[PDB]
Design a binder for this molecule. Structure first.
Ligand SMILES: COc1ncc(F)c(N2Cc3cn(-c4cccc(S(C)(=O)=O)c4)nc3[C@H]2C(C)C)n1
Lengths: 217, 251
């Protein structure tokens, strides 16, 4: 494959008060996320301004996807990269309970019940990353083509590792709309935190970009 | 690999359901406040008219959409509050699919009902903002590029309706269960229609993702309407948070 799922799996493995703790874990992971993106096939071949754009457009859904999968074996909560847990009760006391439940229902639970493996996650995240609809892109077709290769690698993987599950490929993709809506709603909360104990890279990501550029060079 | 008889017939049912619904919506063409012609009078009332016109078109869409859902196998076998939760969330999305379906790349125009043709700028004259109008036409273009036929559209619309992650859905397990045969059918149909083009299916599913964003952009449009004191009719206010819908189902 020109988008080999092995290389994508390598990239996921190569990276191993509620509201504050979430922002703090988010800042931490933004650093990691750049190293993750660099190890996805062809990402770094793209123009540098396009690499920036794609990460700016994707980071939020990308971090949510990964902390969701990371939380598969947790009960009624999520596991942050800081190592700290967040449980329903906290989330609700903090006025963040509605979106919290949606994450558990639409992602964590679904991932668990499917046994969504680490390759399949990787492919979904690479699909999210390579978003031709991100604004400002020099060559959007270039990015659409990369996205499409992930479609193809992924489906093949699914037919080969899970042949008895004919609906598996689609089951994975149909997580993406729910993710998008959930992501929009999380962005909202992050914007509110900003209008009221916040860190430096995260801050950069919420403004309308020097740390990001540095980091990719 | 192969298309079951039950599947063939369901797709037929869906395509039928659509066309029937468009012929009913054409009945309502002289019903609609005419689009003002000639130079606008000083009173300002040609704005108000354009906006009333567009709005009456949407209403007809909502009606068309409800009539369509009712004909989708399974939809009526759901609880009435779920029917509503589903049609509320998905109306704007389906509205946007239909819009794209009625787009013409050569005139860069959109045709509503039989022969009401509107450009980007007509959309602006009718009170919608560029932050909304542009995405609508970017979406139309992307959709045109895909070349969907009437069956692919009908299926994708049904799949859209049976999204279990909508707000206030009380029986989500049932909704995914309903959705799943429609996804299965679309897989088969597309794979028989165009076997050389294996990417058609996921490309299509990814439009469901796009529509979530556009829904959002449409909330931004509602924001700006209230900021400009443009007031939507009851049915649209009901459906976009700004009784009836229940009645439309009950008929
Ligand atoms: C922000 O929400 C909003 N506010 C005011 C509007 F006038 C509006 N319209 C006016 C309209 C007509 N339709 C519409 C769509 C398919 C088919 C038809 S039909 C039945 O006349 O062919 C109308 N959809 C809309 C929506 C929008 C997506 C352009 N939307």
């Amino acid at each position: 494959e020109e988008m080999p799922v092995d290389r994508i799996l390598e990239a996921e493995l190569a990276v191993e008060d509620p509201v504050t703790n979430i922002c703090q874990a988010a800042d931490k992971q933004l650093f990691t996320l750049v190293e993750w993106a660099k190890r996805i096939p062809h990402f770094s071949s793209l123009p540098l301004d396009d690499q920036v754009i794609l990460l700016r457009a994707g980071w939020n859904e990308l971090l949510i996807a990964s902390f969701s999968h990371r939380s598969i074996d947790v009960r009624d909560g999520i596991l942050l990269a800081t190592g700290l847990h967040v449980h329903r009760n906290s989330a609700h006391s903090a006025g963040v309970g509605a979106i919290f439940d949606r994450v558990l229902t639409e992602l964590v639970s679904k991932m668990r019940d499917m046994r969504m493996d680490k390759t399949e996650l990787g492919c979904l995240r690479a699909i999210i990353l390579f978003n031709p609809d991100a604004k400002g892109l020099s060559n959007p077709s270039e990015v659409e083509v990369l996205r499409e290769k992930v479609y193809a690698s992924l489906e093949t993987y699914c037919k080969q590792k899970y042949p008895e599950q004919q609906g598996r490929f689609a089951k994975l993709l149909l997580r993406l709309p729910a993710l998008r809506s959930i992501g929009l709603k999380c962005l909202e909360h992050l914007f509110f935190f900003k209008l009221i104990p916040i860190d430096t890279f995260l801050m950069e990501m919420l403004e309308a970009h020097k740390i990001l550029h540095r980091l990719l060079q | 690999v192969q298309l079951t008889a039950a599947q063939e017939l369901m797709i037929q049912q869906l395509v039928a359901a659509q066309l029937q619904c468009n012929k009913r919506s054409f009945s309502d063409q002289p019903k609609v406040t005419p689009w003002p012609l000639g130079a606008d009078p000083a009173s300002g009332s040609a704005s108000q008219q354009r906006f009333a016109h567009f709005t009456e078109l949407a209403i007809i869409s909502v009606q068309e959409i409800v009539d369509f859902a009712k004909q989708v196998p399974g939809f009526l076998q759901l609880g009435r509050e779920d029917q509503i939760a589903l049609l509320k969330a998905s109306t704007i999305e389906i509205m946007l699919l239909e819009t794209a379906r009625r787009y013409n790349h050569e005139t860069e125009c959109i045709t509503f009902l039989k022969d009401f043709t509107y450009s980007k700028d007509d959309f602006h004259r009718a009170g919608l903002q560029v932050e909304f109008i542009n995405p609508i036409f970017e979406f139309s273009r992307a959709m045109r590029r895909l070349g969907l036929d009437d069956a692919e559209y009908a299926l994708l619309i049904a799949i859209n309706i049976f999204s279990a992650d909508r707000p206030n859905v009380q029986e989500p397990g049932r909704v995914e269960a309903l959705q799943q045969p429609y996804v299965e059918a679309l897989l088969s149909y597309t794979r028989i229609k165009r076997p050389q083009d294996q990417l058609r299916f996921p490309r299509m599913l990814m439009k469901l993702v796009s529509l979530r964003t556009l829904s959002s952009v449409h909330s931004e449009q509602v924001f700006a309407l209230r900021l400009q004191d443009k007031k939507l009719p009851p049915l649209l206010s009901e459906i976009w948070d700004v009784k009836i819908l229940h009645r439309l189902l009950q008929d």
